[model samples]
Target chain A: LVDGFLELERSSGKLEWSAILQKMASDLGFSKILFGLLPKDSQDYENAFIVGNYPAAWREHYDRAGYARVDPTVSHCTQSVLPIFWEPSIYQTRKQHEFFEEASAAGLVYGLTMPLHGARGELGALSLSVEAENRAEANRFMESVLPTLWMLKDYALQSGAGLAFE
Target chain B: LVDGFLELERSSGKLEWSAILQKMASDLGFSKILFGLLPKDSQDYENAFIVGNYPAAWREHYDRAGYARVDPTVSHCTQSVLPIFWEPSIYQTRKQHEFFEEASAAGLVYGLTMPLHGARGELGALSLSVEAENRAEANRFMESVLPTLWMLKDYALQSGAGLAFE
Candidate 1:
């Protein structure tokens, strides 16, 4: 399936990139898959795509008010390639506890974050949402599903994204 | 020496395409060398240069006569990444033999060919000219230098030229 998608994009110049993205999202079996291309100059991203149920009003407000300017998750992906998961109950630090409190107030449950890297120091994030109890579960969950998410990465590269990095 | 140059190119931005060609042609003891990049038409090449002994007259004649049209060396190199050497006795067909006869008279001597893979399924070829007496030494020449050729390829991928194909 991976190579098939690669061959498809190579042979067929006219590929539909978005549908392939949605297919990748479905195959990952997540409630939400958000691929956020990091903002180049700003502290936060201006655009993002959510594949499942994120609070529509919050998402809209995120764009309208640009809440990402202060969002720690987006900031972290810029610096790392590993995955991150954050939830309320697992917090020990005051910042972590406050982050959890914010997420809970917003009705967001569990989250998984991966820092995407490209050839020329390009970085982005792919965050998936699910309903897990704690950060440990969320972390383990992301770890388990990572291989599948990477398959989608191959799919993304095989699509129009053209892994300019590697 | 060849691998060192390739590593240098990788450390920089260019793919060491020229350095690799130089080392291959020089190490093989060929008298004249030419490398070419096939243009969009497939028939035309963005003429590339190498360090060897082909004189002005013969070089011009080669382009004027379009010897690449019927040259067995070029024909064979087109499909292969492997090295191919042509001497007096190993010709596959009588026409192949006759072809070399004409080339020899024009000052084209024993030839060593290396085909290079480039970005987007592109191919590059290098021809090394050596003395007829050196024909027996060609296989060892190939064995010792193929790693250098691969070093070039790997460096090309890292430095950005042979990338994107992968």
Candidate 2:
């Protein structure tokens, strides 16, 4: 993971860095990964700069549906620096529940979201998910990789911030 | 190291982060560590925001004497992202040799300097040094910890950037 991150830092372009990040996530047992930068005061999901291996169709739908406004992960990220695990219980509202189902259908099942709080008030989130047989197994896996994933998120933030804002 | 970085990210103050960074460096076999952020176009050493456990007298003298202008490690960092190992051979100039001798007298005998290139053209360097008996042993120890130290430098960059820039 550290080796991959070093490569990601030296990557010359977005495509190169994205490929490196995807390989790192896959090696860590995640089937899908997404990193998004939410600039300060940016309400529209389209305004966010996102990079990931998630399904294109799902990503488009997510932006079109304005899911950023209701994403529990985003809410947590905006206010905290803690990592939040994705659970069905976190999708409380009807819209959120529907969004969760659509995301799961797109192969983003059990996941962990790591929040990055930048010094300039900008927010960043890196979500890594896997296709697991059951929630318990997924939870255990996420917990096991939490420390490493947490560290990876910082690298992702650096890359995402550079690509998005710089 | 990862845990230390997480703690650093959550650190509420500069002093707290510095202590955590110091502990991390010590745990990694380094006796002294320094992180300095050289803002774009900032030529004066005092203009750079620095944090470290290096001897205070040396640090003050370094700044006052404008050693940064002649420091080989600093020169290497400004041009590349590669880690530069400290060696007498690197100190080519008479002034640089004198500067290196003074640093060695302060117990910064053998070290590795990791360069960080930010998106905004700012440069950061994290130098970890040890009081070793000989160059060969120091070289071996530094090579062994190179990867781990590389990863740690990124964390230090994040923390240092926040403290210095924001």
Candidate 3:
């Protein structure tokens, strides 16, 4: 894990770092990863700094539809330090259900979102997604890598903050 | 390492976290640990928030004598992200020499200070001190634990910033 962090620190740019995160997620059974920072008082996609392997088409749609405003993971990240797992129960509203369906169609089926609260009050999150047969299987896999994933989230937060502020 | 971070997260206050850091430093062959934050535009001891196991007498005298102005490690931490190892050569001036002498007398003989720069422009450092026979021995020991210590510094920075902002 320390080696992974050093690799991230040595990365030249966000794209390089994103590639590192992508490989890391793959090694841990995750199919995709997304890291994003939302500036204070701003929830729009245009104002966010994101790095990930989520499908570009879905990403564009997410932004165009302003799904960030209703993203349960985004809302949870902005308000808490706890990790939130993706599940059907999280999609309470009809719109959220639709969003979930679209995300699932993009292969972000089962996942975990870890919240990072920067000292400057900046909000960020790291989402790791896997295509699992069921929520229980995904949850179990995520739980097995929770500690390592937590450390990765911290490293990502530190590196992402530096990039954003720079 | 992740467990250490979780312990820090579970800490109720700065003192409790300090104790946790003290134990961690001891386990890593260090005799003392200090984590401090300097707010923007301030360098005075009273204006800084600190948590550690450094001697109270030395801390008081260091503050009263305005040693912060001449402390090499403090200065380096304020301006750089690199780790600065304490050595005789760092004391290039009379006042710095005297401050070094006092700190050594207090058992902070050999040390490594890691700087932490926050997104909000807050400056902080985590110093681990050991009573080594020589600089080479100290450096070797610190180098062996550098990666783990770096992660610890990151955790300390995150936790300390939260405390400061709270």
Arranged by TM-score, best first: 3, 2, 1
Ranking by lDDT: 3, 2, 1
Candidate lDDT scores, in order, read 0.51, 0.78, 0.78
Candidate 1 per-residue lDDT, tens place, B8-54, comes to 44543223544554555566454466554442224464253222346
Which sections of candidate 3 miss by over 4 Å? A1-17, A24-29, A38-44, A75-102, A114-123, A130-165, B1-30, B37-45, B65-102, B109-126, B130-166
Local error of candidate 1 at residue A1 (angstroms): 5.4
**Candidate 1, CAPRI quality class derived from DockQ:** incorrect
Clashing pairs in 2: none
- iRMSD (Å) of candidate 2? 8.5
Question: What value does the lDDT take at residue B22 in candidate 3?
Answer: 84
lDDT of 2 by residue, A1-166 (tens): 6678678868887888788888889988898889887775565668777777888999889888989888899887754455678988889999999888898788887888877644333567788888889999999988787667765776676656766776
Model 3 chain B is weakest, by summed lDDT over 10 consecutive residues, at: B115-124
Model 3 agreement with the true structure over B114-135: per-residue lDDT tens digits: 8765544457788889877888
By TM-score, the best candidate is 3
CAPRI class assigned to model 3: incorrect
Error of 3 at A68 (Å): 2.7
TM-score of chain A of each: 0.64, 0.93, 0.93
Cα-based TM-score, every candidate: 0.39, 0.62, 0.65
